[PDB]
Design an enzyme around this catalytic site. Structure first.
Site, PDB file in Angstrom:
ATOM      1  N   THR A 205      -1.183  43.210  76.105  1.00  0.00           N
ATOM      2  CA  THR A 205      -0.652  44.125  75.001  1.00  0.00           C
ATOM      3  C   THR A 205      -1.737  45.503  74.629  1.00  0.00           C
ATOM      4  O   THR A 205      -3.030  45.118  75.274  1.00  0.00           O
ATOM      5  CB  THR A 205      -0.849  43.321  73.787  1.00  0.00           C
ATOM      6  OG1 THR A 205       0.399  42.348  73.728  1.00  0.00           O
ATOM      7  CG2 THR A 205      -0.515  44.152  72.542  1.00  0.00           C
TER       8      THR A 205
ATOM      9  N   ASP B 255       2.237  48.921  73.119  1.00  0.00           N
ATOM     10  CA  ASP B 255       3.139  49.112  74.229  1.00  0.00           C
ATOM     11  C   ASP B 255       4.309  48.105  73.767  1.00  0.00           C
ATOM     12  O   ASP B 255       4.453  47.696  72.736  1.00  0.00           O
ATOM     13  CB  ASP B 255       2.569  48.526  75.491  1.00  0.00           C
ATOM     14  CG  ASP B 255       2.167  47.257  75.199  1.00  0.00           C
ATOM     15  OD1 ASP B 255       2.613  46.238  76.359  1.00  0.00           O
ATOM     16  OD2 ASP B 255       1.474  46.516  74.450  1.00  0.00           O
TER      17      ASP B 255
ATOM     18  N   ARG C 283       5.379  44.934  75.989  1.00  0.00           N
ATOM     19  CA  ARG C 283       5.455  43.816  76.937  1.00  0.00           C
ATOM     20  C   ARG C 283       5.075  42.581  76.360  1.00  0.00           C
ATOM     21  O   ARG C 283       3.992  42.387  75.796  1.00  0.00           O
ATOM     22  CB  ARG C 283       4.842  44.112  78.358  1.00  0.00           C
ATOM     23  CG  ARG C 283       4.671  43.009  79.083  1.00  0.00           C
ATOM     24  CD  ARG C 283       3.781  43.279  80.534  1.00  0.00           C
ATOM     25  NE  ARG C 283       4.620  44.055  81.306  1.00  0.00           N
ATOM     26  CZ  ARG C 283       4.324  44.631  82.562  1.00  0.00           C
ATOM     27  NH1 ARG C 283       2.931  44.556  83.121  1.00  0.00           N
ATOM     28  NH2 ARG C 283       4.949  45.476  83.189  1.00  0.00           N
TER      29      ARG C 283
ATOM     30  N   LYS D 128       6.264  45.453  68.722  1.00  0.00           N
ATOM     31  CA  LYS D 128       4.629  45.078  68.063  1.00  0.00           C
ATOM     32  C   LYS D 128       3.924  45.833  66.954  1.00  0.00           C
ATOM     33  O   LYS D 128       2.984  45.351  66.445  1.00  0.00           O
ATOM     34  CB  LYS D 128       3.609  45.086  69.269  1.00  0.00           C
ATOM     35  CG  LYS D 128       4.171  44.532  70.598  1.00  0.00           C
ATOM     36  CD  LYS D 128       3.258  44.535  71.810  1.00  0.00           C
ATOM     37  CE  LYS D 128       3.684  43.787  72.985  1.00  0.00           C
ATOM     38  NZ  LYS D 128       2.604  43.949  73.995  1.00  0.00           N
TER      39      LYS D 128
ATOM     40  N   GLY E 292      -2.934  39.338  70.426  1.00  0.00           N
ATOM     41  CA  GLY E 292      -3.255  38.042  70.201  1.00  0.00           C
ATOM     42  C   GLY E 292      -1.961  37.102  70.462  1.00  0.00           C
ATOM     43  O   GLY E 292      -0.925  37.519  71.176  1.00  0.00           O
TER      44      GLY E 292
ATOM     45  N   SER F 257      -5.302  43.077  75.498  1.00  0.00           N
ATOM     46  CA  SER F 257      -5.913  42.880  76.769  1.00  0.00           C
ATOM     47  C   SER F 257      -5.983  44.570  77.497  1.00  0.00           C
ATOM     48  O   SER F 257      -6.983  44.599  78.281  1.00  0.00           O
ATOM     49  CB  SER F 257      -5.117  42.206  77.755  1.00  0.00           C
ATOM     50  OG  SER F 257      -3.649  42.839  78.029  1.00  0.00           O
TER      51      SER F 257
ATOM     52  N   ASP G  94      -3.637  47.975  82.847  1.00  0.00           N
ATOM     53  CA  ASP G  94      -3.706  46.520  82.439  1.00  0.00           C
ATOM     54  C   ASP G  94      -2.317  45.933  82.734  1.00  0.00           C
ATOM     55  O   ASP G  94      -1.137  46.453  82.393  1.00  0.00           O
ATOM     56  CB  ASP G  94      -3.938  46.512  80.900  1.00  0.00           C
ATOM     57  CG  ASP G  94      -3.915  44.914  80.508  1.00  0.00           C
ATOM     58  OD1 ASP G  94      -4.625  44.258  81.040  1.00  0.00           O
ATOM     59  OD2 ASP G  94      -3.316  44.829  79.567  1.00  0.00           O
TER      60      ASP G  94
ATOM     61  N   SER H 241      -0.215  44.853  79.684  1.00  0.00           N
ATOM     62  CA  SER H 241       0.518  45.746  79.184  1.00  0.00           C
ATOM     63  C   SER H 241       1.693  46.310  79.874  1.00  0.00           C
ATOM     64  O   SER H 241       1.090  46.269  81.196  1.00  0.00           O
ATOM     65  CB  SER H 241      -0.359  46.734  78.881  1.00  0.00           C
ATOM     66  OG  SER H 241      -1.718  46.141  77.881  1.00  0.00           O
TER      67      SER H 241
HETATM   68  C1  LIG Z   1       0.146  40.982  73.917  1.00  0.00           C
HETATM   69  C2  LIG Z   1      -1.244  40.343  73.479  1.00  0.00           C
HETATM   70  S1  LIG Z   1      -2.381  40.111  74.883  1.00  0.00           S
HETATM   71  C3  LIG Z   1      -1.796  39.875  76.568  1.00  0.00           C
HETATM   72  O1  LIG Z   1      -3.613  41.003  74.496  1.00  0.00           O
HETATM   73  O2  LIG Z   1      -2.870  38.437  74.434  1.00  0.00           O
HETATM   74  C4  LIG Z   1       1.426  40.520  73.131  1.00  0.00           C
HETATM   75  C5  LIG Z   1       1.310  40.554  71.707  1.00  0.00           C
HETATM   76  C6  LIG Z   1       2.770  40.423  71.041  1.00  0.00           C
HETATM   77  C7  LIG Z   1       2.942  40.995  69.800  1.00  0.00           C
HETATM   78  C8  LIG Z   1       4.155  40.498  69.339  1.00  0.00           C
HETATM   79  C9  LIG Z   1       5.311  40.391  70.095  1.00  0.00           C
HETATM   80  C10 LIG Z   1       6.723  39.984  69.637  1.00  0.00           C
HETATM   81  N1  LIG Z   1       6.811  39.231  68.283  1.00  0.00           N
HETATM   82  C11 LIG Z   1       5.078  40.128  71.321  1.00  0.00           C
HETATM   83  C12 LIG Z   1       3.875  40.232  71.676  1.00  0.00           C
HETATM   84  N2  LIG Z   1       0.963  38.902  73.376  1.00  0.00           N
HETATM   85  C13 LIG Z   1       1.783  38.223  74.136  1.00  0.00           C
HETATM   86  O3  LIG Z   1       2.740  38.416  74.683  1.00  0.00           O
HETATM   87  C14 LIG Z   1       1.377  36.423  73.947  1.00  0.00           C
HETATM   88  C15 LIG Z   1       0.278  36.516  74.883  1.00  0.00           C
HETATM   89  C16 LIG Z   1      -0.502  35.019  74.801  1.00  0.00           C
HETATM   90  C17 LIG Z   1      -1.596  35.174  75.793  1.00  0.00           C
HETATM   91  C18 LIG Z   1      -2.275  33.812  76.178  1.00  0.00           C
HETATM   92  C19 LIG Z   1      -2.535  32.953  74.986  1.00  0.00           C
HETATM   93  C20 LIG Z   1      -1.395  33.181  74.084  1.00  0.00           C
HETATM   94  C21 LIG Z   1      -1.067  34.413  73.611  1.00  0.00           C
HETATM   95  N3  LIG Z   1       2.447  35.672  74.248  1.00  0.00           N
HETATM   96  C22 LIG Z   1       2.857  34.785  73.538  1.00  0.00           C
HETATM   97  O4  LIG Z   1       2.624  34.647  72.171  1.00  0.00           O
HETATM   98  C23 LIG Z   1       4.059  33.893  73.866  1.00  0.00           C
HETATM   99  C24 LIG Z   1       5.412  34.143  73.236  1.00  0.00           C
HETATM  100  C25 LIG Z   1       6.442  35.042  74.123  1.00  0.00           C
HETATM  101  C26 LIG Z   1       7.335  35.793  73.149  1.00  0.00           C
HETATM  102  C27 LIG Z   1       7.201  33.901  74.829  1.00  0.00           C
HETATM  103  N4  LIG Z   1       3.519  32.675  73.712  1.00  0.00           N
HETATM  104  C28 LIG Z   1       2.784  31.882  74.841  1.00  0.00           C
HETATM  105  O5  LIG Z   1       2.753  32.384  76.081  1.00  0.00           O
HETATM  106  C29 LIG Z   1       2.476  30.806  74.522  1.00  0.00           C
HETATM  107  C30 LIG Z   1       2.301  29.777  75.470  1.00  0.00           C
HETATM  108  N5  LIG Z   1       1.599  28.730  74.723  1.00  0.00           N
HETATM  109  C31 LIG Z   1       1.385  28.871  73.339  1.00  0.00           C
HETATM  110  C32 LIG Z   1       1.332  27.812  72.392  1.00  0.00           C
HETATM  111  S2  LIG Z   1       2.184  30.344  73.120  1.00  0.00           S
END
Ligand SMILES: *[C@@H](CS(C)(=O)=O)[C@H](Cc1ccc(CN)cc1)NC(=O)[C@H](CC1CCCCC1)NC(=O)[C@H](CC(C)C)NC(=O)c1cnc(C)s1
Ligand SMILES: [Cl-]
Ligand SMILES: [Mg+2]
Ligand SMILES: [Mg+2]
Ligand SMILES: [Mg+2]
Lengths: 196, 204, 241, 240, 243, 244, 224, 219
Positions: H1, H17, H19, H33, H47, H129, H166, H169
């Site tokens: 992100t 972004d 993704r 987001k 996060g 990230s 990144d 993202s």
């Molecule tokens: C980017 C943030 S980053 C790469 O800097 O951590 C995005 C932010 C975001 C915000 C809102 C929405 C839509 N509501 C989507 C995305 N964050 C993510 O993509 C989450 C990054 C994970 C990084 C590893 C640590 C957990 C957060 N991904 C998730 O939250 C996903 C949910 C998607 C939609 C399937 N959940 C997981 O990957 C999980 C795996 N195990 C869990 C307990 S949660």
């Protein structure tokens, strides 16, 4: 972090750098670490940003409610509220706070609250990661009943050295002057203090 | 040890032209041991379908829980719950166990009865909503399904075109996973008919 | 006739304990008044120190709730102080939770909602007080909001409270009928205080010394009460024109 | 301090009456007239702003409250009781509904939730019933436009049009003659202003009348609830 | 009627009759007074000698709160003790959090709010004491008197109990004849006199005088009891004035 | 203290009756009549609305007939708000049972539960009882079609036909006269409406003053269907049976 | 469970013929950093008791307040607060001992070692130790932490058993204590030159000496 | 992100972004987001996505109730406090990393809120990230009191830096421009990558899959 509070003839001055790091990344380079808990009672914050912010907000609340009922609180009273929070929650907190304030009766006062939650009333105090580097300098150069300009120069020189050696410290040197005259905010940029 | 991959299995859902499709494998195991080949992972509450992969005791518990909730919803609202509304209900329900979650990968599928719009959605185990138009995948062969879906899928497929797409996506993904397969089911869902087909696949 | 002892309905649809709490309001025999300027809100109240043994500095029915909010009470002092302490606590909690100073009307509504609870729950009696809150709100400007034992509350252009409230109310009504504006068109609070005192003198038909009045003034970012000498200066200016 | 009132203060009398509910209904009768009328393309609710003093700013006292973007409420009876019902109605519409389903409750269910709160004050320990009757107007996608009344007992009934409080008997008769199933929203506002004029003694204008509608969306949707301005009321009073 | 049977019930007047009945218990008690002086306060009380068997100087009535506040009361003695226990808890919690000893106005409201709380419910009885209290804080001397209703005000002089009218008259003379102020040692002597003059309302039984004081110069701002020579000097002064 | 104001809702009279239960029944006797009739091939629930104005929106209105699950419905007589509290408790119990055993709750078990709740208010807690009497119309695969009633005492009983609310004495005689064990739903519909038509305190029985419902297994493939009759359908059945 | 942060080192003490002596340096260490040079660690209670405290300074400050509060509380409804019903060393100790053991038993100890020195009503010398574990003991000489290893050996040469206490004068005892404080300054890396000493005598009362210094320091052998 | 925000002359520009990743896999290429708090306040989220979503919704809900009771628009400081005090209470276990931006009665304000409950008040911020990639663009080109279309370009450029450099993202660039006179919710603002075109049709013809049994039920 590099923070200090210094009593002088007309009252007390708080001083701080402006760097906040996440490991090696400077998350905020213009951080305001001098926070107001009452009109003329401020604090310097070091440790966990979340913890010191949370504490300072609770203290501000307590002193606001003190003021509603009993009038202006002493600097000692403010320090006691900070201590009570830091000591009773020592296991869950990482906060090193300097409390500084101006009464008309007591004049300038500085209280330091290190990690344990102990309180120490001092003529001046230094704290934060960058403080280690200036114990020698500050002990040699501090005098009691300095003028405002002398105390600004003492803090500026001290934090200049703290910044030079500590990677965790840096940016601008903010200061807050507490006297009978009021509250004055000062800022000093790298181009000024680095050439000292 | 990893609760999401003890029992195994998969769910995939897709949208088409005036239709959705949701499909699942039939395996339940204890890691290497295959136990049941009649463990369906797709349920329905009115016209809204819910696939659930993951720890099978939670799959069962959540099905029973959403049946419970959607029944009371219908009695109070005097109408069947819609896919959009249900998706939010799932998300809420998962997130209220934020620090002791159900080890599941739910997938919603259905057609909004009023607007006629095909709807799908997916969630992580704590209720974050993946809200994608194209397709949603879940389970131990999710990576495999992502690959299959991304290359096979295209928008606005007719029901029986979409059947061939989702089926081939499921079957070929399952055959590259040790913990998925043992049979498969595909629901083709239209605004007022649902076709449920069991697929012939290799039984290893 | 236990429908008159606790807060339950009488056959007429009435809560007699609420009505009797309204009567406790005038037990002090003090009249208060509140008016709005351009930049300020002024509240004045009668001060009566009947005993010579009393320390007159401690005899007050005006309270500094927050720095922006002042509260004058019509009613007995124990209930006044009950209300004051709570309003202070509520205003402090508000600032902590929501990060900005509690608005005058938001406090008034909050205290009114608490007063309502005493009219519905049987174990709690109503407080025998009317609370007049004043501030210069940063959004709404000069503000006067009043709460009573029923739990009613409303904003005011100006208001009066006490045994002779109707006389003061009509005096103020008649002035605003002339000027055709919702406030005292005056720059300095010093003159708005002079107006308030003058119109209370006219309405009540009594002259005042410095020790017969008690004044509170709200400006932007502070509420404060006037000293005896500040009021004396105010009384001199009234007499000289 | 022990809240020792753990027993009901509303009980059945030998005749089968619940005294406190009847007395609460007497309190509602004494309250100022409010009404509601349902059109084909909207609902209107209205009441008199009975100003306690001319020095009071009656704009600050809102008798007509928004509960959700598509639901509004008006009352007759005890104002402070109404205010705490509006607070709880707004809150319950979030806690027990929006935070679960991601949308606002339909009119009937929000009404049912308010009714429940009022019923509980009729049976729980150490409380009197609420001294108000509510008129709740609203719209939702699957039920369309609706108007409900809620009484101190907790009982609620859906209405095509009705009135409560002071001159309700006369007002209901007036509405029975004028109401039909082909009314447009403007026709219903017109009838609401006519009906309300009968029960008002003094000044009758946009500053002394509070009137809101549930109608078209005002620009995810726009809100269907809209409170008419002092000017908008006065415009329709010239075509009266 | 029936409005006086239950505490926290408003009569049609707007009165709480149970509180007014508590006042009758206060009026029934012995005389107690308070005198504010230049840099402090003086407290004195009439202790009725019911019998020769009472041990002299042992049944102490005036109570200390923290180290700087004196409390004395007339009426139901146990109710007074209960109130002082609460006061000590309030003063202790204040000092624990805020470090400084509780200011007298701050302390006055702590008792005030607690006594007022006992007029809010039918499950409790109001306090059967008027409490005279005070001391020296950072802003100087303060004398207070607190009634069963929760009402309290600051005073130059205060008096309650059976001899209150007698005492009040004497206190009013001192306020008039000393506008510049009264000294701490003067106030001790005057307190003795006023209790001796106010004893005419309880004249059947003989009594024992008890005096305490806080003064910035005479006691370092701490509450102390008047004992020995200074007590005898005040008794002699009082005995001379009645004769 | 508070004892002064306590009505004491859970005591015996000297005769051994529960005051508040008896007075609640008196309340219920003034409520609109509700009738349940059980046939061999289904159950009928009929009930009379009360007060009614021309301005009451009838098609979106529900004061008498409520749905507990897909197999069980209730007719109400008494305080509607009190009934809705109990109805939502019952609706939950049915779903708790379904979740636990993966089978629909048997009718009697649900009825006992609600009746036990009502009983509790008569024996402890110091609260007023619920001023409600229910007719439960339901089906399960043990006993088939079942009619029950419960009242504020918490007592419940099973019936072939029964009335609650107003004029039950008159209503129960008329039902006892014309009811027969071999009767069918279409006949029971007619009996229910004829009974209300004679016991009503209104001048005439019209569609706008009625709520009506049937629980038939009379469906394709032997499955139970609840039919809550719409305003137009109640009007048609009134013409069919020859009342209007 | 915590860890001590700002700390105080040795408290040393001994009995003599008429009373007790107690001493402690004025340092608050922050690990190896000699952070606070003006910390008083002898805290008198009335005119007959001195509580010497080592270990965590924040916990010392908590105990200081408890003792201050104990004096206030004992004065309440107590006409003999400055006479027969004044606080005794034994009362003050037992209280602290109760607190210390209660705290260890909740797994949340006050991270200190305490020596209560005083004289009782009947003229008896009181000297007893208590620590973070609630462990208590008395002896003619008592010392905490580092002083136990270095001060006790020197002090025990003056008073080796009970029978030596009447033979020991206040001068001999004070010399011994001051001598021991010098030895500790040479050898304890977390000590300081500046200290406080307190004599509690049954005749002369409480004498509290501030801003004392270690002197007569032998360094001359270093140059070789 | 990659989420970012700047304070410009007339107000606030927020950026994000699109993704959403589960591990190394992309679950949604166009997810939202930039969250709604109140009509004048929005919140970019990074996060743990569930924590981000439900924390913004809860505070948005509570602010709506707060705003109905007070009758006036909510402030950014109150949104900031409510988020802050909750996240602090949960000691970092709610992994919400927010960029909070809005326009008050007191003017435009921008915050960064961290999972542990610390907040910084700043003229520009970046999180996720891709924060370092985005922050590089701000350190290179930010100046105070920018015009609207300039600030839009700077934020868009900062998000783009994250998208490309990144791996966490990607996808489109969403903006949200907030001033006293308007709220512009631009989704998508830019599409910096075209969707990859497929050269073959791999969809199977009808009757290709092997079926065992079938059932049809109407609704
Ligand atoms: C980017 C943030 S980053 C790469 O800097 O951590 C995005 C932010 C975001 C915000 C809102 C929405 C839509 N509501 C989507 C995305 N964050 C993510 O993509 C989450 C990054 C994970 C990084 C590893 C640590 C957990 C957060 N991904 C998730 O939250 C996903 C949910 C998607 C939609 C399937 N959940 C997981 O990957 C999980 C795996 N195990 C869990 C307990 S949660
Ligand atoms: Cl509130
Ligand atoms: Mg540096
Ligand atoms: Mg396989
Ligand atoms: Mg009450």
């Amino acid at each position: 972090t590099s923070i200090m509070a210094v009593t002088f003839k007309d009252g007390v001055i708080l001083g701080a750098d402006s760097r906040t790091t996440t490991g090696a990344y400077i998350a905020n380079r213009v951080t305001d670490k001098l926070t107001r808990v009452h009109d003329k009672i401020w604090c310097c914050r070091s440790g966990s940003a979340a913890d010191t912010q949370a504490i300072a907000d609770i203290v501000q609340y307590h002193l606001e409610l003190y003021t509603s009922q009993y009038g202006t609180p002493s600097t000692e009273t403010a320090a006691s509220v900070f201590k009570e929070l830091c000591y009773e929650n020592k296991d869950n907190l990482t906060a090193g706070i300097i409390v500084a304030g101006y009464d008309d009766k007591n004049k300038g006062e500085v209280y330091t609250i290190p990690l344990g939650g102990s309180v120490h009333k001092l003529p001046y105090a230094i704290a934060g990661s960058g403080s280690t580097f200036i114990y020698g300098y500050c002990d040699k150069n501090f005098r009691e009943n300095m003028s405002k300009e002398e105390t600004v120069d003492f803090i500026k020189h001290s934090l200049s050295q703290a910044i030079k050696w500590d990677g965790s410290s840096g940016g601008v040197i903010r200061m807050v002057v507490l006297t009978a005259a009021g509250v004055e905010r000062l800022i000093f940029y790298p181009d000024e203090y680095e050439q000292l | 040890s990893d609760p999401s991959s003890i029992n195994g299995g998969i769910v995939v859902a897709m949208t088409g032209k005036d239709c959705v499709a949701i499909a699942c494998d039939l395996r339940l195991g204890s890691q290497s041991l295959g136990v049941s080949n009649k463990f369906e992972k797709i349920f329905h509450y009115g016209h809204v379908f819910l696939g659930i992969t993951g720890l099978a005791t939670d799959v069962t518990t959540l099905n029973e829980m959403f049946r419970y909730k959607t029944n009371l919803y219908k009695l109070k609202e005097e109408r069947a719950i819609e896919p959009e509304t249900f998706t939010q209900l799932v998300s809420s329900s998962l997130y209220e166990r934020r620090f002791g979650p159900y080890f599941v990968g739910p997938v919603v599928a259905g057609i909004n009865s009023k607007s006629g719009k095909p709807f799908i959605a997916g969630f992580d185990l704590i209720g974050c909503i993946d809200e994608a138009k194209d397709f949603i995948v879940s389970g131990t062969a999710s990576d495999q399904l992502f690959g299959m879906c991304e290359s096979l899928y295209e928008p606005n497929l007719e029901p029986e075109d979409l059947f061939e797409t989702i089926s081939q996506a499921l079957l070929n993904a399952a055959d590259r996973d040790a913990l998925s397969g043992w049979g498969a089911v595909v629901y083709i869902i239209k605004k007022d008919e649902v076709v449920k087909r069991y697929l012939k696949m290799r039984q290893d | 006739g236990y429908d008159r002892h606790i807060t339950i309905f009488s056959p007429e649809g009435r809560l007699y304990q609420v009505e009797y709490a309204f009567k406790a309001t005038n037990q002090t025999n003090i009249n208060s008044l509140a008016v709005r300027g351009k930049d300020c809100t002024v509240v004045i109240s009668q001060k009566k120190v009947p005993d010579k043994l009393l320390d007159p500095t401690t005899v007050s029915y005006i309270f500094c709730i927050s720095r922006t909010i002042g509260m004058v009470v019509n009613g007995p002092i124990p209930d006044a102080r009950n209300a004051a302490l709570r309003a202070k606590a509520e205003a402090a909690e508000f600032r902590y939770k929501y990060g900005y100073d509690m608005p005058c009307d938001v406090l008034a509504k909050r205290m009114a909602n608490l007063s309502q609870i005493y009219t519905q729950r049987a174990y709690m009696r109503p407080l025998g007080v009317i609370l007049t809150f004043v501030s210069v709100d940063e959004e709404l400007g000069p503000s006067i909001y009043k709460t009573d034992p029923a739990g009613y509350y409303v904003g005011y252009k100006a208001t009066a409270t006490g045994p002779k409230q109707q006389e003061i109310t009509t005096n103020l009504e008649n002035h605003f009928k002339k000027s055709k504006i919702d406030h005292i068109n005056e720059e300095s609070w010093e003159k708005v205080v002079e107006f308030a005192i003058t119109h209370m003198i006219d309405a009540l038909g009594t002259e005042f010394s410095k020790n017969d009045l008690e004044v509170g003034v709200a400006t932007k970012d502070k509420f404060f009460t006037l000293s005896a000498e500040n009021i004396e200066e105010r009384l001199v200016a009234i007499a000289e024109q | 301090m022990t809240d020792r009132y753990s027993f009901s203060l509303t009980t059945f009398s030998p005749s089968g009456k619940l005294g406190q509910i009847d007395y609460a209904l007497t309190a509602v009768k004494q309250g100022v007239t409010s009404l509601g009328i349902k059109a084909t393309n909207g609902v209107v609710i209205a009441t008199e702003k009975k100003s306690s003093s001319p020095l009071a700013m009656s704009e600050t006292l809102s008798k007509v409250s928004l509960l959700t973007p598509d639901i509004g409420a008006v009352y007759s009876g005890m104002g402070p009781d109404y205010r705490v019902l509006v607070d709880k109605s707004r809150k319950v519409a979030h806690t027990s509904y929006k935070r679960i389903y991601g949308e606002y409750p339909p009119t009937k269910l929000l009404v049912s939730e308010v009714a429940k709160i009022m019923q509980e004050a009729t049976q729980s320990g150490g409380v009197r019933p609420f001294g108000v009757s509510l008129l709740i107007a609203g719209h939702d996608e699957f039920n369309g436009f609706s108007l409900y009344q809620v009484d101190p007992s907790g009982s609620y009934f859906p209405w095509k049009a009705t009135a409560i409080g002071k001159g309700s008997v006369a007002a209901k008769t007036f509405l029975e003659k004028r109401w039909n199933d082909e009314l447009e929203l403007e026709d219903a506002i017109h009838i609401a202003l006519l009906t309300l004029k009968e029960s008002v003694e003094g000044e009758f204008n946009g500053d002394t009348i509070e009137l809101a509608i549930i109608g078209d969306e005002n620009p995810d949707k726009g809100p269907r609830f809209r409170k008419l301005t002092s000017q908008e009321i006065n415009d329709r009073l010239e075509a009266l | 009627t029936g409005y006086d049977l239950s505490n926290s019930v408003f009569s049609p007047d707007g009165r709480n009759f149970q509180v007014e009945y508590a006042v009758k218990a206060v009026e029934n008690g012995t005389t107690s007074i308070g005198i504010k002086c230049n840099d402090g306060v003086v407290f004195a009380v009439e202790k009725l000698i019911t019998s020769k068997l009472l041990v002299p100087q042992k049944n102490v009535k005036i109570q200390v709160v923290d180290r700087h506040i004196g409390c004395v009361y007339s009426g139901l003695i146990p109710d007074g003790r209960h109130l002082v226990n609460r006061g000590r808890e309030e003063a202790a919690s204040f000092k624990k959090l805020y470090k400084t000893p509780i200011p007298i106005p701050a302390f006055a409201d702590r008792l005030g709010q607690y006594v007022q709380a006992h007029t809010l419910y039918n499950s409790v009885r109001p306090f059967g004491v008027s409490t005279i209290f005070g001391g020296v804080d950072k802003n100087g001397a303060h004398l207070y008197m607190l009634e069963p209703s929760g009402s309290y005000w600051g005073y130059k002089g205060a008096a309650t109990g059976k001899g209150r009218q007698s005492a009040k008259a004497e206190l009013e003379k001192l306020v008039d004849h000393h506008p510049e102020g009264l000294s701490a040692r003067e106030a001790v002597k005057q307190a003795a006199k006023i209790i001796y003059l106010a004893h005419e309302d309880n004249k059947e039984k003989d009594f024992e005088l008890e005096i305490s004081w806080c003064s910035l110069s005479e006691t370092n701002g701490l509450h102390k009891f008047v004992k020995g020579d200074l007590l005898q000097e005040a008794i002699d002064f009082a005995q001379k004035e009645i004769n | 203290g508070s004892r002064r104001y306590d009505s004491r809702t859970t005591i015996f009279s000297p005769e051994g009756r529960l005051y508040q239960v008896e007075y609640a029944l008196e309340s219920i006797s003034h409520a609109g009549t509700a009738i349940g009739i059980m046939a061999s091939d289904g159950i009928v629930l009929a009930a009379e609305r009360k007060v009614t104005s021309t301005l009451l929106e009838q098609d979106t209105s529900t004061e008498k007939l409520y749905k507990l699950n897909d197999k069980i419905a209730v007719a109400v007589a008494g305080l509607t708000a009190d009934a809705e509290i109990l109805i939502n408790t019952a609706r939950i119990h049915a779903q708790n049972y379904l979740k636990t055993y993966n089978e629909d709750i048997p009718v009697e078990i649900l009825v006992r539960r609600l009746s036990d709740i009502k009983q509790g208010y008569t024996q402890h807690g110091g609260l007023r009882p619920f001023g409600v009497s229910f007719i439960y119309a339901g089906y399960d695969d043990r006993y088939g079609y079942q009619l029950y009633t419960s009242n504020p005492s918490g007592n419940y009983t099973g019936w072939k036909a029964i009335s609650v609310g107003a004029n039950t004495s008159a209503a129960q005689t008329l039902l006892q006269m014309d009811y027969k064990d071999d009767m069918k739903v279409d006949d029971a519909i007619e009996l229910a409406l004829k009974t209300l038509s004679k016991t009503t305190d209104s001048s005439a029985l019209t569609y706008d003053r009625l709520e009506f419902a049937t629980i038939r297994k009379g469906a394709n493939d032997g499955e139970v269907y609840q039919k809550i009759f719409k305003p137009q359908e109640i009007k048609d059945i009134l013409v069919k049976t020859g009342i209007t | 469970t915590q860890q001590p942060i700002v700390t105080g080192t040795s408290v040393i003490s001994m009995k003599y013929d008429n009373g007790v002596i107690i001493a402690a340096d004025n340092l608050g260490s922050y690990g190896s950093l000699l952070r606070f040079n003006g910390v008083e660690r002898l805290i008198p209670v009335g005119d007959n008791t001195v509580v010497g405290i080592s270990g965590d300074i924040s916990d010392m400050q908590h105990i200081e307040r408890l003792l201050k509060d104990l004096v206030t509380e004992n004065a309440y409804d107590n006409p003999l607060a400055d006479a027969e019903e004044a606080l005794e060393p034994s009362y003050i100790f037992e209280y602290l001992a109760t607190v210390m053991y209660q705290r260890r038993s909740k797994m949340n100890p006050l991270w200190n070692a305490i020596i209560v020195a005083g004289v009782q009503s009947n003229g008896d010398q009181f000297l007893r130790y208590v620590n973070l574990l609630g462990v208590t003991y008395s002896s003619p000489t008592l010392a905490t932490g580092f002083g136990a290893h270095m001060a006790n050996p020197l002090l025990r040469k003056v008073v080796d058993r009970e029978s030596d206490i009447p033979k020991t004068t206040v001068q001999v005892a004070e010399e011994a204590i001051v001598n021991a404080m010098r030895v500790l300054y040479y050898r304890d890396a977390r000590s300081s030159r500046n200290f406080s000493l307190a004599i509690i005598d049954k005749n002369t009362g409480l004498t509290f000496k501030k801003n004392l210094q270690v002197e007569n320091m032998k360094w001359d052998f270093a140059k070789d | 992100t990659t989420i970012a925000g700047v304070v410009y002359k007339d107000g606030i520009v927020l950026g994000a972004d699109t993704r959403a990743t589960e591990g190394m896999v992309v679950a949604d290429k166009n997810c939202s987001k930039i969250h709604f708090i109140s009509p004048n306040i929005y919140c970019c989220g990074a996060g743990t996505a569930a924590d981000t979503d439900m924390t913004t919704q809860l505070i948005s809900s509570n602010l709506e109730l707060h705003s109905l009771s007070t009758g006036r628009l909510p402030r950014v400081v109150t949104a900031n406090r409510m988020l802050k005090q909750m996240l602090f209470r949960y000691q970092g276990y709610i992994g919400a990393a927010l960029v909070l931006g809005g326009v008050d009665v007191t003017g435009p304000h921008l915050y960064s809120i961290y999972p542990h409950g610390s907040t910084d008040k700043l003229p520009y911020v970046t999180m996720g990230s891709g924060s370092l990639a985005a922050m590089a663009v701000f350190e290179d080109k930010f100046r105070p009191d920018m015009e609207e279309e300039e600030a839009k370009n700077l934020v868009s450029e900062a998000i783009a830096a994250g998208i490309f450099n990144d791996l966490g993202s990607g996808g489109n660039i969403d903006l949200c421009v907030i001033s006293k006179n308007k709220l512009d919710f631009l989704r998508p603002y830019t599409v910096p990558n075209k969707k990859g075109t497929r050269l073959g049709r791999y969809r199977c013809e009808k009757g290709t899959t092997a079926v065992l049994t079938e059932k049809i039920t109407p609704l």
